[PDB]
């Protein structure tokens, strides 16, 4: 699927830098998680989980573009 010819986008170094920064931030968020036994969850777990929609959305946008 190429959608014939439209206003086609071109690679932009700031875009790649932003994607790289997003990956680094995701790595940090994954590294700042504590796993507790049974069903206990640290209070920061909810705040950490709120960030996942944003990261998955920006990655999907990058992939689509």
């Amino acid at each position: 699927v190429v959608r014939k010819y439209a206003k086609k986008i071109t690679e932009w170094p700031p875009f790649e830098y932003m994607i790289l920064a997003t990956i680094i931030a995701n790595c940090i968020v994954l590294a700042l998680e504590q796993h507790l036994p049974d069903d206990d969850k640290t209070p920061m777990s909810e705040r950490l989980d709120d960030t996942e929609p944003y990261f998955i959305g920006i990655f999907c946008f990058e992939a689509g573009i």
Binding site: L36, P37, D38, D39, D40
Partner: protein, 97 residues
Amino acid sequence: YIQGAASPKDMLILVDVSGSVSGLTLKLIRTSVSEMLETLSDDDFVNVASFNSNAQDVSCFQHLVQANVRNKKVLKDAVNNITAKGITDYKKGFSFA
């Protein structure tokens, strides 16, 4: 010594059950509750509660029972048959106690 060192008490043990206290900590809590129950007397009233996310009584007793040799045994069995689950909520356990 316990009789002569203080006055009759109204004790409410508030055990914390949660995912974190699972394992060795739960066994230590069980043993500690049993031992501290052993320090009560007939003149003292005691009830044991627990709370993961909503507090509940660990035994059939609901309000308070005299620390006889039978009520203490019932409380000991109830605390020995306890399990650890859920996410801790202090604001409910204390409001229950």
